[PDB]
UniProtKB/Swiss-Prot annotation:
Belongs to the protein kinase superfamily. AGC Ser/Thr protein kinase family. cAMP subfamily. It is a lipid-anchor. Keywords: ATP-binding, cAMP, Cell membrane, Cytoplasm, Kinase, Lipoprotein, Membrane, Mitochondrion, Myristate, Nucleotide-binding, Nucleus, Phosphoprotein, Serine/threonine-protein kinase, Transferase. Autophosphorylated. Phosphorylation is enhanced by vitamin K(2). Phosphorylated on threonine and serine residues. Phosphorylation on Thr-183 is required for full activity. Deamidation proceeds via the so-called beta-aspartyl shift mechanism and yields either 'D-Asp-3' (major) or 'D-isoAsp-2' (minor), in addition to L-isomers. Deamidation occurs after the addition of myristate. The active site is at 152 (proton acceptor). ATP binds at residues 35-43, 58, 107-113, 154-157. The modification Phosphothreonine is found at residues 34, 181, 183. It is found in: Cytoplasm; Cell membrane; Membrane; Nucleus. It comes from the Eukaryota. A number of inactive tetrameric holoenzymes are produced by the combination of homo- or heterodimers of the different regulatory subunits associated with two catalytic subunits. cAMP causes the dissociation of the inactive holoenzyme into a dimer of regulatory subunits bound to four cAMP and two free monomeric catalytic subunits. Activates cAMP-sensitive PKAI and PKAII holoenzymes by interacting with regulatory subunit (R) of PKA, PRKAR1A/PKR1 and PRKAR2A/PKR2, respectively. Interacts with NFKB1, NFKB2 and NFKBIA in platelets; these interactions are disrupted by thrombin and collagen. Phosphorylates a large number of substrates in the cytoplasm and the nucleus. Phosphorylates CDC25B, ABL1, NFKB1, CLDN3, PSMC5/RPT6, PJA2, RYR2, RORA, SOX9 and VASP. Regulates the abundance of compartmentalized pools of its regulatory subunits through phosphorylation of PJA2 which binds and ubiquitinates these subunits, leading to their subsequent proteolysis. RORA is activated by phosphorylation. Required for glucose-mediated adipogenic differentiation increase and osteogenic differentiation inhibition from osteoblasts. Involved in chondrogenesis by mediating phosphorylation of SOX9. It comes from Bos taurus (Bovine). GO terms for biological process: adenylate cyclase-activating G protein-coupled receptor signaling pathway; adenylate cyclase-inhibiting G protein-coupled receptor signaling pathway; cellular response to cold; cellular response to glucagon stimulus; cellular response to glucose stimulus; cellular response to heat; cellular response to parathyroid hormone stimulus; intracellular potassium ion homeostasis. The lineage of its organism: Eukaryota, Metazoa, Chordata, Craniata, Vertebrata. This is cAMP-dependent protein kinase catalytic subunit alpha.
Length: 320
């Protein structure tokens, strides 16, 4: 049964108290190309020279992490990532550091990412949409089981691997909390209301987020949108949603129960909790273990690194 979860709460708690450090070195890798550069670090497709494989290497300038006051978000991302295992979570393969930089070597997810697929296709049929939502629910079941709130769900973070399945990436806003917490963070279209009204909030913000994701997937656009962020903030608070013509009925009611402004009458956060997600008419034709196992047919399958001679920021990244 869910002896699987307590077996994984153990595996994660052990890696959490004694995280792995220094499991590779930059010399044993080779620059192919710069995938991207930005908020989440500067990432590089690289090849492991003694094995053949490819990986996404995120490189962070330590001095710049300190300047931008991102020390603890960075240590925390790494610490969570090296402790978690689930088939829809991208894997921190290796991590290490050197004089100038930190390095997180990740599974390379080469099939592009969901934001970009919505953009170019237009929208997903409801079955296709439902294939992804399943993986996210099973992912949020796991993460929530180890007391990890995700807080960055959005299409841009959801890569599509070579068997059509989803890998969640970016743990930058992830937090380990048993109780409640308060940081205003995350993509505005995806924020649940209690985050904006600056009360505390809990695990439940990830299910609101799921609903925003389900909507955006199914519809082609997110349910609360504007040219300005406070205008997105304003709509979420007012809780008024217009489903487009072609939405099915059973779905249109799923999105009323995940996008519920009222904490206690909201799916995910209940007596039952997660099973209200699974035991529901829109997920009737969804085998919840064939998804885990990867047996379902997926609906669609597509600079110099200057390193200083002197060590920088030694004490502030000693845990890394
Ligand atoms: C910057 N955005 C454009 C593409 C996706 C998005 C960033 C989301 N994202 C994708 C990451 C990963 C990968 C990326 C694949 N193509 C990219 C292009 C830019 C940035 C990252 C990636 C990857 O292969 N494995 C990953 O884990 C990643 C690693 C750490 C933090 C955020 C990340």
């Amino acid at each position: 049964v869910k002896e699987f979860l307590a077996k994984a709460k153990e595996d994660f708690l052990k890696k959490w108290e004694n995280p792995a450090q220094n499991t590779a070195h930059l010399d044993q890798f080779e620059r192919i190309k710069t995938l991207g550069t930005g908020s989440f670090g500067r990432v590089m497709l690289v090849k492991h020279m003694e094995t053949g494989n490819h990986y996404a290497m995120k490189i962070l300038d330590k001095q710049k992490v300190v300047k931008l006051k991102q020390i603890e978000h960075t240590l925390n991302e790494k610490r969570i990532l090296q402790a978690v295992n689930f088939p829809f979570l991208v894997k921190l393969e290796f991590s290490f550091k050197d004089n100038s930089n930190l390095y997180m070597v990740m599974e390379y997810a080469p099939g592009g990412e969901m934001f970009s697929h919505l953009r170019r296709i237009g929208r997903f049929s409801e079955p296709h949409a439902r294939f992804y939502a399943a993986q996210i629910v099973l992912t949020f079941e796991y993460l929530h089981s180890l007391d990890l709130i995700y807080r960055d769900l959005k299409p841009e973070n959801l890569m599509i691997d070579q068997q059509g399945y989803i890998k969640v990436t970016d743990f930058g806003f992830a937090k380990r909390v048993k109780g409640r917490t308060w940081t205003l963070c995350g993509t505005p279209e995806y924020l649940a209301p209690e985050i904006i009204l600056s009360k505390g909030y809990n695990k439940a913000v990830d299910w609101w987020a799921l609903g925003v994701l389900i909507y955006e997937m199914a519809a082609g656009y997110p349910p609360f949108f504007a040219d300005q962020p406070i205008q997105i903030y304003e709509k979420i608070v007012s809780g008024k949603v217009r489903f487009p013509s072609h939405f099915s009925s059973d779905l249109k009611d799923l999105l009323r129960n995940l996008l519920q402004v009222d904490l206690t009458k909201r799916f995910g956060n209940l007596k039952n909790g997660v099973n209200d997600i699974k035991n529901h008419k829109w997920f009737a034709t969804t085998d919840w273990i064939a998804i885990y196992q990867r047996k379902v047919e997926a609906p669609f399958i597509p600079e110099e690194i200057r390193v200083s001679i002197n060590e920088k920021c030694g004490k502030e990244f000693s845990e890394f």
